Symmetry: C2
Subunit: 162 residues, 2 copies
């Protein structure tokens, strides 16, 4: 009877996309993965959008979230290249650019991209950076944005507490 | 590199639910499965909602759509019983009652239930049955409703044609 995914729990399927964020230049391409089972997000920054940038991002995401059963992406070439298909086959991860979803596409990662860019803008401005964030402060700020969205430790819709 | 699902195509995941339709009494429980990759629908009628009715329905759906990689259901007991879990393990089909979706729950099968009940009401009324459909005409009418929703062969949003 060995089938997934962790009891009756949700299946381990990720959605990944690249989004451009000039406040993070020169490594302005943010690769973002949302795990649809937990809604956890992993983001990494890249100088150019290539097949290798996608593989480097997923290598980091696997270290953080574990190996997923499948990854959903759009049809960009960094995801459909022979190189990327081989990398995913090496890890045994299924890939779809498909629609076995419940609504139009990969809404989850699109919402994540928006929340992430908003969070980076609010934190950077809080620190006094209204335009590009200085290169030496980018990593900590991106880490801070990722923490804020994942360990949202909140009352976001809760009752009084200390 | 052998991973799913049929190239870059959508993964083979189904959504299944039971819905009550008194026009089909005495076997008024309709079990409905929507394949999220193709949007095909399979419906069967049952006298009572039990674990065995769910297994009988999926046996028919597998003959029509092939064996899926996973099936998503809610937490009703006919789906979480030991009997049903064993049946799914016997076939090697993963089961989730989860949320690895892109919106709230299993909207797909809920929309399917609505379209199906509307279609049965319009066809039955067309035949002169305003209340319960006579037992001997139910199977053909349910088959007609299933055909209408799957081989929707349409211009449903298309240009002039013969």
């Amino acid at each position: 009877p060995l089938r997934e995914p962790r009891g009756l729990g949700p299946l381990q399927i990720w959605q990944t996309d690249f989004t451009l964020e000039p406040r993070m230049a020169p490594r302005s391409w943010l690769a973002v993965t949302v795990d649809t089972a937990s809604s956890a997000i992993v983001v990494t920054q890249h100088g150019r959008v290539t097949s290798v940038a996608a593989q480097h991002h997923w290598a980091t995401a696997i270290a953080v979230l574990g190996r997923p059963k499948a990854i959903k992406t759009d049809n960009g070439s960094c995801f459909t290249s022979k190189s990327t298909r081989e990398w995913l086959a090496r890890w045994g991860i299924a890939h779809t650019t498909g629609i076995p979803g419940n609504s139009q596409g990969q809404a989850m990662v699109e919402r994540a991209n928006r929340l992430l860019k908003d969070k980076i803008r609010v934190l950077a401005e809080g620190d006094g950076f209204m335009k590009r964030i200085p290169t030496s402060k980018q990593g900590e700020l991106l880490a801070k944005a990722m923490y804020a969205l994942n360990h949202f430790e909140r009352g976001e819709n809760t009752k009084t507490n200390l």
